[PDB]
Structure 1
Amino acid sequence: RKIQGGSVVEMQGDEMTRIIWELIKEKLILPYVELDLHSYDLGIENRDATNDQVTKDAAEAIKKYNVGVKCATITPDEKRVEEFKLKQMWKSPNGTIRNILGGTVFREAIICKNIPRLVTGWVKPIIIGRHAYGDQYRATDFVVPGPGKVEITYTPKDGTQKVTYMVHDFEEGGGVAMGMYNQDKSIEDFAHSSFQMALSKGWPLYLSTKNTILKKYDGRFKDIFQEIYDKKYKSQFEAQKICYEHRLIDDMVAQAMKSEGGFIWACKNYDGDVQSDSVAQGYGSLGMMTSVLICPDGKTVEAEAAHGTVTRHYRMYQKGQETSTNPIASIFAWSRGLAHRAKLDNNTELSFFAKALEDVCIETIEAGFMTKDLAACIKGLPNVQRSDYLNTFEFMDKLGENLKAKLAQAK
């Protein structure tokens, strides 16, 4: 009999990750777990067919059932419009979901003992807490077609006192302009999540901004964090002998690069996006990172891989050429979602299954069976032979066999 899993929102995606997602459900999930599975096809063609309504529906379902697991998706630009004959240049589904749910996206490498890093000093984990709301990911941007003025205006709801600011007077030619924003409550929730995560690990917490340049916008982040620290967390931090520090982002990225790891890094949305990929690659691979959106309600989570649809590998797949795409991040999307589902429901067998799934992945790699990205960590990319790694499908097969044995040996 299969494990009774409960309610989980599943979002399918695009290109190489869509194929991997199918293999994960077929070989690793469905043979062992029966789920109340609420599935939403966020493939690009279905998003286009539904005028992106399928994306909004999925987000509302995550809010209802409190657990979502999402496959990487195409965010379309002009080249994608021509490729898929799109009606519109749809917004990122991740930006849409995060805008609705809010919260902090926590990202952390998945570590194997036999995988050398590219950054020599990182012997302890770096955990990025990426603010999931606003800034560049909910911006209003446009092409300035020629000479003219761009202004930004604030009108208070108690229609008494409006302010207009000059952004730029385009005297010659055109260019681009944009407005973006963030909300106090969202920044407050982001602070609370970062302080709580640091206390949960017993590690120092660092916030990065560029408040010397964006004195008002980034100053608000720095001020809210410091206020919340002083009033709610300072004594707990002092009790655990850990600290909280604000740093300018350019200092911070260099400090992280030379650190030993073992800190929480609170990142504004954009910095969290960019630096999580830098950090993932520094440890090993984009295929070896977890990403979990923890919503401010302390109950709803959305788990995903940090990487994209791996288009470049997909193009090799389309030509029949052998590919070796790392599926572990996609697998930990499922394992982290199912683990949270089990924690909500006190589902003992599902908790065991989710941890066993993660253990199989680590054990398999550490025994010497891995995809090409990890073989390249060990040997160096010029020295990688075909005999050093498994292709995507061989590796999925090896994981399937090792999970079968683990679950059988457990019964």
Structure 2
Amino acid sequence: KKISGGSVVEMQGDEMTRIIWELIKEKLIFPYVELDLHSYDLGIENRDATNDQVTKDAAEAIKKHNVGVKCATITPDEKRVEEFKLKQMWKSPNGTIRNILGGTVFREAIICKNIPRLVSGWVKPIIIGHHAYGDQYRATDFVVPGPGKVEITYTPSDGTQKVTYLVHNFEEGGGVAMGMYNQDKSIEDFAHSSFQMALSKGWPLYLSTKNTILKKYDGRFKDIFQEIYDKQYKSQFEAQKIWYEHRLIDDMVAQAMKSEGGFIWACKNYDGDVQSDSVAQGYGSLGMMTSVLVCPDGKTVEAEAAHGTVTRHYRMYQKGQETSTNPIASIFAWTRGLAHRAKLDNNKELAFFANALEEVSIETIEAGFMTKDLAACIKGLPNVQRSDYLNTFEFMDKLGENLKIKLAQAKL
């Protein structure tokens, strides 16, 4: 009787999201879908036990099966080394996985009619993608201890004359200096992933840069996107009545603020971390922010929540205290992964199910059943009372009962 789901790579994670992840599987997925799960435990102590090889193996399995669904993981810092007695500060699994796959991470906010938006006008979500988590990760920085010239040079491999550019002549005192870069192939992958994302959604695409200032650096992004668009995607976009345009970031922000949402935005910038995005943080609930890593081909995806492991809630849970952890972004990591699996395999039953679970999630909240973070979006955190929300387990139970009702009603 269960839906034949097919091959899905699953990456288990840490702390509160690891608890919610199991509730999702037990209550929302496994009662209705049978899957050929290729499970990789990306929990912090199994990552330490395999010297982070499990992360690389999981990344390779996604490349092989084209569908990944990942739970939030701990990115180690020095406290985590003291906490778990780690071998070394293992790098972010999110960073390791998208490096190995060569994809673009697109973020999307899950919208509910009763949850106020930062901008009232935004009727459809805005999907934003960044170039390999931002240029901040491709920087080489140092202290200039005193006077002297800082220069950036390019020495051709073919033996042609080197080109030197003056960064700054420090005439008196010191300062700081740094070098950043991008490879053409990485920009091309970013363009292809962005065009594929726009065609799969049936929404227009904008690329934003600061090409008025970084005329050469940002100009290259504008040129590569336009070249790829004209040659390969223009007719396909026209057929769906969508378009692609470059925008100076100044105009893009003003435009996005006056729009109704419903577009893809390839944002060329320095910091692609969701944590430092004031609009992502201003929505009031990181629990509603999902992410999808899309590839140039448009055939491989890895879906995960944009939020972290929710350590503060995990500490309450460890003491037997009630929590109200929002599972929506984690649920949409499963629905987005399953929707892609269903598309690749022409599995109408799995496609129907994946959409129904997203609908049930939104309808539950729209009917006034929600976690504390969402009740705080409506009333303001100081005005929230216990009767305004459901705890983590009550909310999962409500979704499970509404999903059973949705699928029972559908049989007719």
Native 8 Å contact 1:115 1:284 kept in 2: no
Taking structure 2 as the reference length, what is the TM-score of the superposition?
A: 0.87
**More displaced stretch, 85-94 vs 247-256:** 247-256
Change (3 A) 1:230 1:74: same
Displacement of 1:237 in angstroms is 5.7
3-state SS of the aligned residue for 2:274? Answer: helix
Structure 2 match to 1:45: 45
Change (3 A) 1:260 1:148: same
Native 8 Å contact 1:103 1:133 kept in 2: no
Change (3 A) 1:384 1:31: same
The CA deviation string for residues 17-55 of structure 1, in whole angstroms up to 9 with x for no partner, is 111111111211222222111111111222122111111
Structure 1 stretches lacking a partner, 5+ long: none
**More displaced stretch, 109-118 vs 224-233:** 224-233
Q: CA–CA distance in 2 between the matches of 1:142 and 1:39?
A: 42
Displacement of 1:408 in angstroms is 3.5
Change (3 A) 1:277 1:28: farther
Structure 2 match to 1:85: 85
Change (3 A) 1:101 1:173: farther
Taking structure 1 as the reference length, what is the TM-score of the superposition?
A: 0.87
The CA deviation string for residues 177-236 of structure 1, in whole angstroms up to 9 with x for no partner, is 665432212212322333444455554432222334434322211222233344445566
Displacement of 1:71 in angstroms is 0.8
Change (3 A) 1:29 1:152: farther
Q: CA–CA distance in 1 between the matches of 2:271 and 2:133?
A: 12
- Matching of residues 370-389 of structure 1 within 5 Å: 370-389=370-389
Native 8 Å contact 2:193 2:297 kept in 1: no
What's the Cα RMSD here?
3.2
Change (3 A) 1:374 1:156: same
Q: CA–CA distance in 2 between the matches of 1:211 and 1:177?
A: 21
**More displaced stretch, 203-212 vs 387-396:** 203-212
3-state SS of the aligned residue for 1:271? Answer: coil
Change (3 A) 1:317 1:254: farther
3-state SS of the aligned residue for 2:272? Answer: helix
Identity %: 95
Native 8 Å contact 1:8 1:36 kept in 2: yes
Structure 2 match to 1:193: 193
Change (3 A) 1:6 1:83: same
**More displaced stretch, 346-355 vs 61-70:** 346-355
The CA deviation string for residues 382-410 of structure 1, in whole angstroms up to 9 with x for no partner, is 22111000011111111122222333344
May I ask how many residue pairs the two structures share in their alignment?
A: 411
**More displaced stretch, 252-261 vs 140-149:** 140-149
Structure 2 stretches lacking a partner, 5+ long: none
The CA deviation string for residues 349-390 of structure 1, in whole angstroms up to 9 with x for no partner, is 222221222122112111111101111122222221110000
Change (3 A) 1:53 1:172: farther
Q: CA–CA distance in 2 between the matches of 1:327 and 1:116?
A: 19
Q: CA–CA distance in 2 between the matches of 1:79 and 1:258?
A: 43
The CA deviation string for residues 263-303 of structure 1, in whole angstroms up to 9 with x for no partner, is 32111365544499544445552211332111112211111
The CA deviation string for residues 46-73 of structure 1, in whole angstroms up to 9 with x for no partner, is 2122111111111011000110001111
Displacement of 1:320 in angstroms is 3.5
Change (3 A) 1:93 1:139: farther
Change (3 A) 1:309 1:360: same
**More displaced stretch, 49-58 vs 248-257:** 248-257
Q: CA–CA distance in 2 between the matches of 1:146 and 1:43?
A: 46
Native 8 Å contact 1:107 1:276 kept in 2: no
